[PDB]
Design a binder for this molecule. Structure first.
Ligand SMILES: Nc1ncnc2c1ncn2[C@@H]1O[C@H](COP(=O)(O)OP(=O)(O)NP(=O)(O)O)[C@@H](O)[C@H]1O
Ligand SMILES: Nc1ncnc2c1ncn2[C@@H]1O[C@H](COP(=O)(O)OP(=O)(O)NP(=O)(O)O)[C@@H](O)[C@H]1O
Ligand SMILES: N[C@@H](Cc1cccc(C(F)(F)F)c1)C(=O)O
Ligand SMILES: N[C@@H](Cc1cccc(C(F)(F)F)c1)C(=O)O
Ligand SMILES: [Mg+2]
Ligand SMILES: [Mg+2]
Ligand SMILES: [Mg+2]
Ligand SMILES: [Mg+2]
Lengths: 258, 258
């Protein structure tokens, strides 16, 4: 009989498509040696042929999608003024209020892209023709209870369109084309949320809303935010989102502790 | 005569290749209106035709280079254990000691890639054939005095090879092919530093060194780290590195305050 510790160890080495039944009579040392050999060969194959990181490759694929659909690629600060959080309407009695990683006195690691996107929409409206279409992909940070769907350090896609054409129908069409392009099953639940079963892939919004005024925004808009690691978790059928994270423990979902 | 404040404003709107002499008799309001029109059209052109962010595009170009030369693409945590800094030999009497952005009690924003790359070299040596070739591109953070060559939030390329072939000659060849591929003039000064005039583009190293033992490393290695914003600063002839940063004030080196 395998111990709980022994099966924890074998699960770390098990990949979702592996056709190995641990429940078999063979001893731990044999099962472990078999999985070690498979995971080493998986890494050798990546090293020999493709060599691209899941998270980076997904970011490049998403970037190509939105650039081709006419969205401007934004790269804005990750370390943002703490005042952006309050101006987002976030204070006591909101969950996000307590999830913020603070740096020094006046700064924090961004938990969301909306502040910087708001600022870019306002400034670019003075230069660019209607409608204004932008997106950003990059790190975001939230303090979280241990979860199989939550990382404290994750990667967010955010996209926003401002001006004409900002209808719910057009928003659902962007989401639908995007996730069909990636090959990720979903349902849109209606603000609106893009779900994979019980897992939230995205929350999306249709403006205007009263908050827009604080940011100097006075036009209709549509937008959404997606976690890339949740997308990888669904696409690759990982049982825990840690396999998709920036990590020293997993490479493209393969254990690095061999 | 233009005030210092007025010329500060016009310089924000001036692009390096602009053939406009501010020294001309025309009044501030006219010069400003002329530059505003040029910068707006520069942004319209980006929005119409390419739409890619300088920093992201450079990252993708560098990624393609190293992947094609056989380096594995790494994406590891940006928020790292504070213990990695001490184990790097960094304490009082080192500059970097005081430059660290600390988060909570046991963590910090990484100021360097060497800790995570060291850990990846050690773990991948159990799976991959010799030599082991990896690279990473991503955010790094250092507290800095105001500088025209320094950002507090920047982007670092790090690459490292471990095992056979780790000679100084092979290291200089990687650097030389890389910067000739990007079109960036340089000189190698000899550890070794890759300089553009007085601007340091890279510091590079040849192991083994005694520090390797703390990280479980016992093979020869070569590697280097490059700041992407310094590369963009040289390539685009920006007078201040802020034009290349993650920013809300500049898009591809064009002022967003129009
Ligand atoms: N801690 C996290 N780890 C991974 N992805 C996250 C995390 N927090 C948010 N996301 C993703 O980022 C998207 C935009 O943020 P948001 O809509 O605020 O998520 P959320 O409301 O916190 N969903 P949830 O925390 O699961 O109840 C979400 O739809 C998720 O896909
Ligand atoms: N604050 C910064 N802003 C932008 N790039 C940086 C910064 N700090 C380091 N870099 C880049 O990262 C590379 C690797 O880090 P490192 O060799 O430690 O730089 P460095 O020794 O601090 N050079 P310098 O700070 O200018 O005296 C450097 O060669 C720079 O190109
Ligand atoms: N509220 C989260 C997710 C989100 C939701 C809807 C619209 C956007 C955005 F992309 F338009 F910003 C983002 C965030 O701000 O990142
Ligand atoms: N000392 C810095 C830069 C550096 C220098 C030489 C080698 C590397 C590396 F890529 F091999 F890590 C990195 C850092 O650690 O990022
Ligand atoms: Mg949450
Ligand atoms: Mg949500
Ligand atoms: Mg320095
Ligand atoms: Mg140096």
């Amino acid at each position: 009989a395998l111990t709980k510790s022994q099966t924890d160890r074998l699960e770390v080495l098990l990949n979702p498509k592996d056709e190995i039944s641990l429940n078999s009579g063979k001893p731990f040392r044999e099962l472990e040696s078999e999985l070690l050999s498979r995971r080493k060969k998986d890494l050798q194959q990546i090293y020999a042929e493709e060599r691209e990181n899941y998270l980076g490759k997904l970011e490049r694929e998403i970037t190509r999608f939105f650039v081709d659909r006419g969205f401007l690629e934004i790269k804005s600060p990750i370390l943002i003024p703490l005042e952006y959080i309050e101006r987002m309407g976030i204070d006591n009695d909101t969950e996000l209020s307590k999830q913020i990683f603070r740096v020094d006195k006046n700064f924090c690691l961004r938990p969301m892209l909306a502040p910087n996107l708001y600022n870019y929409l306002r400034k670019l409206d003075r230069a660019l023709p209607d409608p204004i279409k932008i997106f950003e992909i990059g790190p975001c940070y939230r303090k979280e209870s241990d979860g199989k769907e939550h990382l404290e350090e994750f990667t967010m896609l955010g996209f926003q369109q401002m001006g004409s054409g900002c209808t719910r129908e057009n928003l659902e069409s962007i989401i639908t084309d995007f996730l069909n392009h990636l090959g990720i099953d979903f349902k849109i639940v209606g603000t609106l949320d893009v779900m994979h079963g019980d897992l939230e892939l995205s929350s999306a919004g249709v403006g205007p809303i009263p908050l827009d005024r604080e940011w100097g925004i006075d036009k209709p808009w549509i937008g959404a935010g997606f976690g890339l690691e949740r997308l990888l978790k669904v696409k690759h059928d990982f049982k825990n989102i840690k396999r998709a994270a920036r990590s020293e423990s997993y490479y493209n979902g393969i254990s690095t502790n061999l």
